[PDB]
Amino acid sequence: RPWSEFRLTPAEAAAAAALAARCAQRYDETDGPEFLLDAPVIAHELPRRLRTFMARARLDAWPHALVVRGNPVDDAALGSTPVHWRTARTPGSRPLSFLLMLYAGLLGDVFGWATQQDGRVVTDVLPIKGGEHTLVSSSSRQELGWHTEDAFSPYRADYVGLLSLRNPDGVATTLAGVPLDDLDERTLDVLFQERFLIRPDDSHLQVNNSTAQQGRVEFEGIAQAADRPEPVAILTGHRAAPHLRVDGDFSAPAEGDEEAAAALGTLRKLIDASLYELVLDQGDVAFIDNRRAVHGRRAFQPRYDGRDRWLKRINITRDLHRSRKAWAGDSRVLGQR
Amino acid sequence: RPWSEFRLTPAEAAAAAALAARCAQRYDETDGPEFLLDAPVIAHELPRRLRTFMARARLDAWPHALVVRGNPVDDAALGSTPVHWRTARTPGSRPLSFLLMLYAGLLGDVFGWATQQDGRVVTDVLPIKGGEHTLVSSSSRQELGWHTEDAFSPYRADYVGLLSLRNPDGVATTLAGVPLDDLDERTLDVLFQERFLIRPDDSHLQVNNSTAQQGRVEFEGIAQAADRPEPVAILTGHRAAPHLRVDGDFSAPAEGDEEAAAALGTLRKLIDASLYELVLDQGDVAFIDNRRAVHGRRAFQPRYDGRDRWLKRINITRDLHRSRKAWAGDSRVLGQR
Ligand SMILES: NC(=[NH2+])NCCC[C@H](N)C(=O)O
Numbered sequence: 001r002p003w004s005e006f007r008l009t010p011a012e013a014a015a016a017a018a019l020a021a022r023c024a025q026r027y028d029e030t031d032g033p034e035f036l037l038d039a040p041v042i043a044h045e046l047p048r049r050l051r052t053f054m055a056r057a058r059l060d061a062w063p064h065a066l067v068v069r070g071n072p073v074d075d076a077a078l079g080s081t082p083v084h085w086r087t088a089r090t091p092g093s094r095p096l097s098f099l100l101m102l103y104a105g106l107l108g109d110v111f112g113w114a115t116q117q118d119g120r121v122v123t124d125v126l127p128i129k130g131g132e133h134t135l136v137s138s139s140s141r142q143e144l145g146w147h148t149e150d151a152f153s154p155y156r157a158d159y160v161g162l163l164s165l166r167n168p169d170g171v172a173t174t175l176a177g178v179p180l181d182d183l184d185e186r187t188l189d190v191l192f193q194e195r196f197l198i199r200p201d202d203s204h205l206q207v208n209n210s211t212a213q214q215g216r217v218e219f220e221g222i223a224q225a226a227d228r229p230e231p232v233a234i235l236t237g238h239r240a241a242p243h244l245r246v247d248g249d250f251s252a253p254a255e256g257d258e259e260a261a262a263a264l265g266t267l268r269k270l271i272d273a274s275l276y277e278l279v280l281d282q283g284d285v286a287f288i289d290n291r292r293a294v295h296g297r298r299a300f301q302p303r304y305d306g307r308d309r310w311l312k313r314i315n316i317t318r319d320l321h322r323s324r325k326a327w328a329g330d331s332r333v334l335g336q337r
Numbered sequence: 338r339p340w341s342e343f344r345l346t347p348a349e350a351a352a353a354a355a356l357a358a359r360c361a362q363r364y365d366e367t368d369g370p371e372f373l374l375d376a377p378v379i380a381h382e383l384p385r386r387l388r389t390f391m392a393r394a395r396l397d398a399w400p401h402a403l404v405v406r407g408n409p410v411d412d413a414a415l416g417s418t419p420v421h422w423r424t425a426r427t428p429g430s431r432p433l434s435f436l437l438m439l440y441a442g443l444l445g446d447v448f449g450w451a452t453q454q455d456g457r458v459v460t461d462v463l464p465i466k467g468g469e470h471t472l473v474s475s476s477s478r479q480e481l482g483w484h485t486e487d488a489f490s491p492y493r494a495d496y497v498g499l500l501s502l503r504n505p506d507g508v509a510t511t512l513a514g515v516p517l518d519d520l521d522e523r524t525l526d527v528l529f530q531e532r533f534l535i536r537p538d539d540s541h542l543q544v545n546n547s548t549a550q551q552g553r554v555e556f557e558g559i560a561q562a563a564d565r566p567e568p569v570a571i572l573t574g575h576r577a578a579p580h581l582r583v584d585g586d587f588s589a590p591a592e593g594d595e596e597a598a599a600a601l602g603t604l605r606k607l608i609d610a611s612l613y614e615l616v617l618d619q620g621d622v623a624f625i626d627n628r629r630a631v632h633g634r635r636a637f638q639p640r641y642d643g644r645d646r647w648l649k650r651i652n653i654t655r656d657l658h659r660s661r662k663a664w665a666g667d668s669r670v671l672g673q674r
């Protein structure tokens with residue numbers, strides 16, 4: 001497999017669940033300052049075999065993601081899938097949100113965006129009725145196109161954590177790495193040059209946040225990035241193992257740069273051709289390497305019967321201080337004027 | 338204080354020492370692949386109050402370093418200070434080398450350089466007879482000028498760990514942050530521009546490595562960086578809290594750029610004026626923030642009687658994958674053709 005996989009024993013899974021439940025009892029919320037600070041140390045109490053996996057697999061050169069299988073989820077206890085992310089912090093999902101944050105603490109510094117889902121650190125992925133054909137993660141009938149998470153931003157995550165609360169019909173997450181086996185050197189050269197525009201995706205629009213937030217000064221920075229994007233490279237670092245920054249629906253070549261356009265067009269076709277599926281079954285967690293891979297989600301027919309697919313999500317950086325310019329009165333919720 | 342300080346209780350210090358001693362019994366060496374991989378997980382067994390300090394203090398916005406006081410060191414057990422770093426992996430210093438690596442594992446990914454002290458991850462700082470007036474860390478009579486560690490390299494450490502094995506005469510480490518209170522905005526503007534040359538320091542020369550290593554292809558990259566340095570910025574990131582990349586003895590303005598030169602000259606004087614002292618007494622460990630501060634060491638008269646000042650040192654990055662281009666057949670020992 002192109003990802004690294006770990007399966008918890010039932011005993012390990014129960015121990016991790018018990019730890020998350022204890023945290024849920026002792027702390028008021030996941031995104032509170034106290035649990036944000038404490039979670040990385042509390043995570044040291046997770047099962048040792050899991051801690052070893054996370055410490056080693058993060059340092060491997062190859063995987064597109066780290067996948068942890070086997071966290072129990074009781075649908076009766078969980079309750080119905082929320083109709084919107086706003087109302088998605090349900091008591092039934094609370095322990096699992098704490099669990100995701102504990103796992104994330106083993107990989108780095110968690111953070112959110114002032115301009116996405118009301119500045120929440122733990123976010124939700126679920127289908128919103130009426131929003132089936134949008135470019136945001138609450139779509140369904142329209143495939144969520146492949147992307148580097150928050151591609152527009154230099155402060156985008158190193159890892160994106162996804163915990164599947166439920167996924168009864170096995171809807172696939174999509175993944176692709178750099179198509180290095182098919183990129184000729186001239187095309188590769190051009191992708192390494194600062195000749196591309198990457199604009200913020202629609203999740204950072206005021207319309208996709210609550211009316212109270214509309215509001216925040218950080219939406220100004222989003223507008224600046226959308227209106228006047230700075231040319232950047234799609235590939236960076238080592239030519240034999242490049243890091244990737246692209247969004248199929250929000251990337252463009254620099255104004256009138258047809259050579260850059262050709263390179264982006266070639267990249268699109270090669271990523272489309274190599275895209276593969278990872279199904280996060282109920283209880284599965286994935287930490288996608290946001291530098292090695294783009295990801296998306298297959299089109300699916302939403303149910304709207306209370307049992308729709310539902311993920312908790314979290315952004316993770318290896319170094320919070322990289323984003324200090326965007327510390328919006330809060331180091332864990334990023335944005336700029 | 339401009340650094341964050343933690344003092345171990347005797348019980349905590351003894352527990353940490355016992356853990357390091359256990360590691361020293363079970364592993365062949367600190368730089369072996371096994372302990373490199375295991376140390377970050379074994380470090381989860383360190384005293385909880387220390388783990389909390391390291392997890393929180395790393396995320397604070399202000400400190401120039403994280404300092405841990407109170408590790409016991411028995412001079413009789415330690416033995417005499419080595420005459421050279423080559424011979425400095427003495428049995429008496431072995432547990433303390435493991436201790437340094439355990440502490441470092443709480444902050445990030447440790448690594449070394451193919452071209453410095455024979456590619457060792459745990460390195461040594463001690464005075465070498467005949468080398469009193471050099472620009473390397475084995476100097477004594479000549480002050481070690483302030484510097485960002487490995488300033489020339491984009492893969493330089495985020496944190497530099499220093500453990501004082503002995504320092505009987507209390508020789509000071511020097512530190513300085515960005516002199517933001519005195520830099521005018523025009524000068525600040527220029528320091529943020531890619532108008533400066535930073536060459537590799539003398540520790541990366543073949544003459545300062547063993548004759549067997551002279552040898553390695555990675556010295557080619559050092560020569561390239563010395564002969565044809567690429568213009569880079571001294572300050573990066575947030576203008577209200579910039580990150581710093583400079584070396585007093587190995588920095589220069591870009592060819593004929595007198596405005597850049599003026600900015601560097603002003604910076605020199607302001608750093609010289611704000612330089613302060615941190616004395617690492619026997620058993621003290623410091624993790625210097627290599628982005629917020631430059632550091633050095635005061636001139637001292639060497640003893641050469643077997644009780645000279647002696648530190649173990651280690652480079653730490655928040656993300657090993659940042660340096661994958663420089664993974665020299667080994668992700669933990671960096672260098673390039
Ligand atoms: N090509 C795209 N649709 N990009 C945007 C991805 C989805 C966005 N990050 C969200 O959570 O809604």
Ligand SMILES: NC(=[NH2+])NCCC[C@H](N)C(=O)O
Pocket residue numbers: 472473474475481482483484486487538539540584585586587
């Ligand atoms: N300005 C300087 N002397 N810079 C070089 C610093 C010392 C070097 N990192 C060493 O270990 O020897």
